[PDB]
Design a protein around this ligand. Structure first.
Ligand code: SAM
Ligand code: SAM
Ligand code: ZN
Ligand code: ZN
Ligand code: ZN
Ligand code: ZN
Ligand code: ZN
Ligand code: ZN
Ligand code: ZN
Ligand code: ZN
Lengths: 279, 14, 76, 286, 76, 15
């Protein structure tokens, strides 16, 4: 981190050099509030999880693929045939629809096809794997720092992006809970109480979802996308829009869950806004 | 204590 | 012959079986040796889930081969 | 892309340029100063890593061991004997890369790199391949061959270009494929080790800029096996490294048959080789 | 105690060792049971390679644990 | 040989 001999426009263009190398739809940067050039320039963008020491990665020996049609992928009309859907143990509907959007009735866990499946990459049940489709604008908010807004229309259920970063153990995460400014990038992989144990930190590496700001009335939510259905320790943290989003609307998600029956000031301005995200 | 959380799968997240 | 079934925990169960033992028989043996009901067993070999009707020989499972057991869950 | 309506030359070229702009890493450009062909095939998706298929067993992390060079200060290159990742190397142990990040001239065909289990950072000098493409590559149209790739910047000997990516498939699936015998193919056998020659990378439907590299009997780049799971040898990165200094806009070409043997004098198949080299064998296999 | 060794080709070997045993002794036992020279052996546990002079107890390898055997590259 | 691209093997190196 030198960035002292770099000017305003030089720093902004360096950050945009980082952005233009991001895989997929373009990610851009605008500032309509203050004269800050860009977010921290030490940050490096990554396209997938960066596991660290002491993080047991998914063992592929416990992974099993379906044998649905290789041409058209698995058919959403016949979910019983799909072997990698026999783990939900319910009416057993595919998480997505024909249009690739998650269903409004689908639960919080997504079971997707893996390498062992015979279906192609165009399979209807590989939405998170295919990657981002929405161009996102990183913009300076007025009371929350940087944030992300969408540029094109996104219907409810549309996939957005994965929360990426360094996957670290509970010990390493407990060592780096320095939040030295109301600044936190720790996302606990606490979707399953029986596994947990891991946390994705976006402080130094991560995705554009790292700029997603908390809201007590969000428009997007987080889903656990699973490719090795056996393992529940490491999995994709996919962001899906649960509300219809117009262009230029900031993408926000709740930093916690419903938790019913069980900086520090929140500047989201919601009707149900408790003054702290505590997250 | 202050970390982003999926909130657990215990609620359906609908 | 002998085969080994590995759990996500790291437990290694030893089974005495034959190539003609059905996957149902293997699940019953797993139940006897560990108390895991067959309905919540998921035996996996070579990236594919083992089916009840077939035998170990059908899946080309020889001696001292390794099967992997995923305990089925419903509500996460 | 349900293009029920005809896409013109301009629209096809623009769609391919948009795809190139969406590739991860530095920019990739498209040039055709030969004919009216708008672009390479649009029925393609660039991928930033291997896509494994059914029947291919992926690398097992239990057979992978990291190194503990964080106590040295992050995998010092002057102290390679202290790195666990170099255990399976020779007795004169040395990292593949030099101080400036280029593969050394005496480096073997196998590059053992650090992995998730190591205690170093992504800035570890033994993680060159994992950092990805660094040069701006231009897809151009060759005179006699199809599409080729060149570098807009100077590529000194030992520079890392990119990886050969695509679908990793079994020999059985590659045999159900290989209809591409009737005259372009994107099949690259993962055959660095005859003890672990099982899979093949097909860059037909999915792959990387490297799938546009052409063959030459006098190559300027060659293949290295970049291995992160040192216990596994059926799946590994097919990294490209420049074997001689490459002037700007010079076409990046590698030998499809790899490094030729030295003992057997005797020991076409697809096309007449039109690489134009003075030593051109005239028989390209692949 | 009883421990397990998992090989690349899918075979799983059982071994009778002690916490006092050295990894060189474990490689010698693997040789005696499978015919693999100790110098051409890499034992891996919990993401770490096991050094020859050290003992199993130093790696906290308790009973019924599973080591992973990697055969060294010689060619080049 | 086979009409596919190959590494060339272990013992031979870049030349
Ligand atoms: C994961 S970072 C992403 C935002 C961006 N990196 C920035 O510069 O603010 C989230 C940080 O923004 C602030 N923040 C996020 N949502 C907020 C909200 N709804 N109200 C007030 N502050 C918020 C918090 O202080 C938190 O440290
Ligand atoms: C991986 S593709 C090369 C890039 C791209 N497919 C293209 O348009 O050429 C390999 C095919 O390109 C052709 N090719 C590659 N190098 C050649 C050469 N030096 N002379 C003639 N044809 C060549 C061969 O027909 C081969 O099947
Ligand atoms: Zn599928
Ligand atoms: Zn299926
Ligand atoms: Zn599937
Ligand atoms: Zn609020
Ligand atoms: Zn090291
Ligand atoms: Zn290392
Ligand atoms: Zn390192
Ligand atoms: Zn030639």
């Amino acid at each position: 981190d030198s960035y002292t001999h770099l000017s305003f426009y030089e720093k902004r263009e360096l950050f945009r050099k980082k952005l233009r190398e991001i895989e997929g739809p373009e990610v851009t940067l605008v500032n309509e509030v203050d004269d800050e050039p860009c977010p921290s320039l030490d940050f490096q963008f990554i396209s997938q999880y960066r596991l660290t020491q002491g993080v047991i990665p998914p063992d592929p020996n416990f992974q099993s693929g379906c044998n649905c049609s290789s041409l058209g992928g698995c058919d959403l009309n016949n979910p019983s045939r799909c072997e990698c859907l026999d783990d939900l143990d319910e009416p057993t509907h595919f998480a997505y629809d024909a249009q690739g959007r998650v269903r409004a009735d689908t639960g919080a866990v997504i079971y997707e096809c893996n390498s062992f499946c015979s279906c192609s990459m165009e399979c209807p049940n590989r939405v998170v794997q295919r990657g981002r489709t929405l161009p996102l604008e990183i913009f300076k908010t007025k009371e929350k720092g940087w944030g992300v807004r969408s540029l094109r229309f996104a219907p409810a259920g549309t996939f957005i992006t994965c929360y990426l970063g360094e996957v670290i153990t509970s010990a390493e995460a407990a060592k780096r809970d320095k939040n030295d400014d109301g600044i936190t990038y720790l996302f606990d992989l606490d979707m399953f109480d029986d596994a947990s144990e891991y946390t994705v930190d976006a402080q130094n590496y991560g995705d554009v979802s790292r700029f997603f700001n908390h809201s007590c009335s969000p428009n997007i939510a987080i889903y656990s996308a699973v490719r090795n259905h056996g393992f529940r320790t490491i999995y994709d943290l996919a962001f899906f829009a649960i509300k219809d989003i117009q262009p230029l609307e900031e993408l926000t998600f709740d930093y916690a869950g419903a938790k019913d029956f069980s900086r520090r000031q929140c500047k989201c301005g919601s009707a149900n806004c408790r003054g702290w995200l505590f997250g | 204590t202050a970390r982003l959380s999926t909130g657990g799968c215990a609620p359906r997240k609908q | 012959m002998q085969i080994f079934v590995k759990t996500l925990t790291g437990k290694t169960i030893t089974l005495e079986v034959e190539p003609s033992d059905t996957i149902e028989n293997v699940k019953a043996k797993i139940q006897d040796k560990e108390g895991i009901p067959p309905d919540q067993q998921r035996l996996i070999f070579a990236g594919k889930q083992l089916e009840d009707g077939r035998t170990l020989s059908d899946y080309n499972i020889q001696k001292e081969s390794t099967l992997h057991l995923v305990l089925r869950l419903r509500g996460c």
